[model samples]
Target: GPVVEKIAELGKYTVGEGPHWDHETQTLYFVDTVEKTFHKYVPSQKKYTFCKVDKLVSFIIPLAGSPGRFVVSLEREIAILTWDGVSAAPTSIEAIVNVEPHIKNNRLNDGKADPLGNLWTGTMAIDAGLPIGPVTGSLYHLGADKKVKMHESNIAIANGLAWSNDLKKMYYIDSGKRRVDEYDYDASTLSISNQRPLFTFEKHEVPGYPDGQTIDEEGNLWVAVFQGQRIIKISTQQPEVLLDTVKIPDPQVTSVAFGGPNLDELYVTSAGLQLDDSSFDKSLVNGHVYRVTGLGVKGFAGVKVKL
Candidate 1:
């Protein structure tokens, strides 16, 4: 495991999620879901920039062959983002399976580009902090042709998703459940079954529930335990034992991604919203990103979104 170090305090986020490393440009693209914005960071140049998107932007992913273009998820739909230099323009904000069109409380949450190029995202009930009604959130699979299907339903705070590099396993996180679940993944068909818990957390043991997550090349699972104030790594070979941990200064660590030319660098995102007044005065650590190193590990390269 590596030591945590503060990196960039870029965007203001309610849920600062989705940090995806781009191999083509070596930039990390991520978002602030509640603020309806996204930020970009280039490790090679040590550069950073931000842009506005249409709605509460939860996640962003690059296309297979398309550069400077992305499929981004907003409230209840997916949209295209194209940029020439600094500014971004959103086009065709289309709804997939449409989230029923009338459900005002549901919005798309965590997602990523699968190894097969399909973009997988899910819906989450807003006001997840409180006992919202029945869990209406669900996971969705959006095909390249825009064909949509309900991948999984009856979820709350749909967050953290990824597939094992071997293409045989898929992992997911639901904050309300505070558990990391696994499924039999069929990469060719983009389907998941055999749901079971890969790991579980006792709420206060770490405080926050599991938020954002990723899989390492070694098959280790890395997750941000929001309100838990830290990122944790557990070996798939033995989930009951703790493999590593990186404690953050803030209580809202939301997501993680591996970046850098060598693919050994870990980048993290956090939130300052809904926190105590003292949370900020303590070096104002809220809403920041961190760069971690020396864990002696490398991550799998992110695959482009397939056609």
Candidate 2:
């Protein structure tokens, strides 16, 4: 059984996303994509804070061996943001490389660093807003050596990403397809191959699209579903099976990550923006982040960007 509770004091986020638990600092980092803000939550001190950024940011992760430096996604550019955890704005932002410079109005979305610290990020067209344009997105890999490479194209919304416990497999979600895909992962070379469909929400009778996900120590995946109001846990075996579900008050569960000192607590991010007015409900809570405990499972610590 799991217990769900809202982190009431953290306030609301328009498009809360990219939850990353820094085991070294015992802190949680996420972003408000619509608000152009970055947030940090320190459980040990019970402190939550945020800073405004210049552009829409989808993800933020610490740079390897650098406490005050972070690798951040600012629209099309992958930049290094320097902050002291006490600043209202970042100390400085240095651009590393732009992922899709040729595509106008394209922006970065969800991203994660591989075991070797190479960043795997995706992009989507921003001109259309709601009901995004199909086949207008692509996935990019920023190597630890600062090289940018494109992998997949014609993606509508490149979302959730996770790696197998043994580091031999990678899981990805293309929301437009309503399914998760698996790949043969080679962390040593920072490459992926043998792509195949791992599972689909249609088969599980799940509503909404998968947005973000995290894999547990036991090789189970907990995926946040947009407009679905719940997070679903699934076994990663050949025939993926639903194991459990954790319902949240918010309709848009954007992302989830394991935090707390023991890495057993699940922190979920949500959205307040109603893409379709017809589906809006005043009674349901939205925009707030949530925490689920008593799962009896743990997660591996997040790896920092090597660059």
Candidate 3:
């Protein structure tokens, strides 16, 4: 089943981002950043649910051990949202921590939880009408103790994040940098060291900037390429190599998550062109989510916010 098919019935989005698979519930969760919407879809039941908000929400993940509780990026702050999955909107939302509060132009971007369940997220400048904005982004980590720490700064577009299956390394992407960086991860101390570039799109001649990323059960990194119309798989072992490429129909492929009862299916999210006209033709399949199967690999469940 190495085929790509659109989830047309789920509708479209201006900026579709974050595709997370929850194995226990057998559901997929994603976000529409530009539209400020949270979405959920159960593939088996063919049921879809969404909640729209007043502000931009980049990503959402479940809180470990807390039913119906989620950690969401609400613009510049990290907030907790309570929803029943079936609700049209979250029952409650409370800001837990604010990042770069003084910098009104910066907002949270891509984020994910580590194997240890700590939330790792980043921020970027809100370039209203530009392609590459100022280098105002930074990387952050929120631990179980409720403390937020800045791990890196001076980033332009903070995107994609993943960890090796053995928990020995963490991979990250600053889209402006055009490469994926590797860091030595210390599981016991919960920190990263020895930063170095592992994979460069320029060196490989891959088009588009890497957006969101994930790791399969075999420990390979799968990255979504915005504007490139594809997602490439990378082998993180010695001499880091490009393993495979999966072409997506949308030009703005944003993020990827693997989900399904067996954990072998890949779910991808994308974005449509941001135009002044809200009535733009929906014929363009740029903003719909797609599912890919027969990749011959399985992915781990999305790590929950352990706090």
Candidate 4:
């Protein structure tokens, strides 16, 4: 079913994605990578605030137990940031590590913390719009111990990150491959191996980029079909089977997550960068966050980042 009419039109983000939820504060933080901006949305008050991140913030994960602190992957570097809850400029910022300073032409993308409190994010070619570019981007993991390192390599566009409810498996997306992959996860060592495709689709099969994703309590995977104007809910256990689909008016549906006080609503982020005068009417709804409900399923509040 389609979601309740869009909850709010936050802003005109050139490229909007990575919607991270804050259960404690009833806040939603997401980024507009190209615009170097982020929006903090408060649904109860039906209002939002904007700030300049001063750099390309691909993804932001709130630090666990620390309301104003965050672990952010900006471009190719990771930093521990303390915010004033008012703007993008942090009260104090500490550099974690540069992921791939040597790989110029690529930057980080979608990411989140696992159930084990480990932070994982992936990279993308800076010239993503061009047909030619090196795929040096890879997925990087920052364990709770504060060690930052590359978890995997040779990815064209790493779009989403999620772990199974049991914590024995890790699921990831190499959007460039047009597929979602799974790996054997080791909770103790915090490592993953033996990857297998969970789902695969042809780029031309649909007019979308298989972008960001999240898992529900039932182990189902809800994926944002970017530029396709829809979200496809798939059975993680059975990748060939699609459970449901949520339609939107905008073309670039970047990502999705569960929010609302009850954790019963689905929030989505979109991009207006693809919009042009040819579709000014549809472009009006672009670059905003959306709320979805009524499908009748509960979601996990999501884990916070530890390192």
Candidate 5:
């Protein structure tokens, strides 16, 4: 298939990183990392609205049970934001996890709810702390009972997490190493093992690294290549690049999610962070939302919050 086609220019955002579509609302929700805000884009009306928050917002997923409610990850906490699809402000905000004391330069990076309705998010240290290596980051799981549990640690940068269509396997990305790993999942016990590399980039061939990823119906992985100006599609069985490149202007492509009514629209989030004056000028299209239509893939349904 053709790489990608830009659909809209969301000029109101800076550091637009996470773009997730809520099937219930038929709208897309994304976050501005530097601005510490959450946004909702209604495609039908061609309007974009936002809600300001207190901390750096990384991502948002709709609450499983409550209508117009969502779970959001901030700098050091996970909170709830309730909205009616038209409000400029959240109806309520509540925190589910607090890691301020243990958090140094790290903040929640990328996250999503699993098939069983539990939230799984990864955290990473900021620049100047350490290099991306074996033990710098961590992943946590939040259960339906409002209990938080640490699943794994010693990760460089916990960037993306997803599961197979049959729910038999789980996949993750250690962005620092520019590799994707798969784990043998025990769904009933909610545990994983056998961490092995599924894909890795050669020295300087690919862009920066793999940032965020999602799976298609056939169990193929779609990953956003940060600082590489493309997105990659890889098959589960082999490391070969099924789709070599889906080009975008932004050097830092943060994340990708499949959306739209038929689940064919691919929405990608880009970044404008760490760019110098000249680089920033060249990457003016960075931090905007771009859409690619006609690719057929239905995303896994997000877990709803249970009251």
Candidate 6:
């Protein structure tokens, strides 16, 4: 609910989007979209490590059972990456989807594994770029059995996908619409239905929309508002401001995640990739990762993929 405390100053990334904390390793994992690199930061030791990839990286989630193992979403597909603790490349990689055949302009965007142990991802038009697009995005679900299916389609920038505390409901954000939606989730069947609008952006007068999001232990959704220069926290019942706003220096607050030992610390990622030279110069802290403390909720650990 409070403004983020700048924990670590990561100079300038082209576009830093995902910030996932590995509780077992006590490290923070994130990706630089334009740089195509996966980063790891040891908060206790204050050391940072990185791995270079071949394509633009949208998100990275650490594997459940194996340390240094992760699943990454690239421009067109999802791959499994195995880190060797040093500057080695990912041991093995596999393409879950190759959009080159169907949609050439679409690229993989923000994503995370659901409570049901299924990977949920989204896509958007590459040319439309940040905070600008019609309803051209869609949400997909990749099950543990490696079956890929379309969950929802005809969305404009399908960014945030988070589940409720009890795993009975799913929350999704269609950024172009500037609203977060809720669904009746059946965790047992890995299905969702009964879509309803949970929260809409009425406070910000800007042209930005909700980007990435996460659910706290209390089931409140914390959403990063792209081009709005702030993150908004929404409760289940009240559409009114739960946390008025957590301001960041950059206008593009791409995503937010809860991490740290107690899971009270909130990590945020901003963007600088699509801005022009003039606009980018005005963004002092663009494409930097930030941390905010004093959140009362803890996030559930990511589910381990049996595959």
Strongest candidate by TM-score: 2
Residues 197-277 of candidate 2 have per-residue lDDT tens digits of 887888989888889999999999899988789999987886557788888889989999998889999999999876654
How much does candidate 6 score in TM-score? 0.89
Model 6 C-alpha lDDT per residue in residues 1-307, reported as the tens digit of each score: 4656655546566778777776777777888877888887777787777888788788888766777678888787877787764574676777665533488777788888886557788887776544455556778877755667777888777688888867788999877777888998888877789988887676435346788898888778888977777787778756544554667777778888787788888888887765662333563545777888766567755444434
Candidate 3: stretches off by over 4 Å: 128-131, 275-285
Candidate 1 colliding pairs, count: 4
Error of 3 at 130 (Å): 7.0
Model 3 per-residue lDDT tens digits across residues 1-307: 2799899878888888988788899988889888888999999999999987887889999988998988999999999999898788899998898987899988899999998899999998887322455888999999755778888988888888999988899999998887899999988888889999988998888987888999898888999987778999988885458988999888778899999888888999999865443233445546888999999999999889887
Q: Write down the TM-score for model 4.
A: 0.91
Which ten-residue region of model 4 has the weakest summed lDDT? Answer: 275-284
lDDT of 1 at 303: 66
Clashes per candidate (backbone, < 3 Å): 4, 0, 0, 0, 7, 0
- What lDDT is reached at residue 280 by model 1? 36
Error of 2 at 294 (Å): 1.1
The lowest-lDDT stretch of 10 consecutive residues in candidate 3 is 276-285
Clashing pairs in 4: none
Relative to the unseen true structure, what is the Cα RMSD of model 3?
Answer: 2.8
* Better candidate by TM-score, 2 or 6: 2
Per-residue CA lDDT of candidate 5, range 97-190, in tens?
Answer: 7643476677887888777777788787654122333355678877656666677787677788889867888999878777888888888877
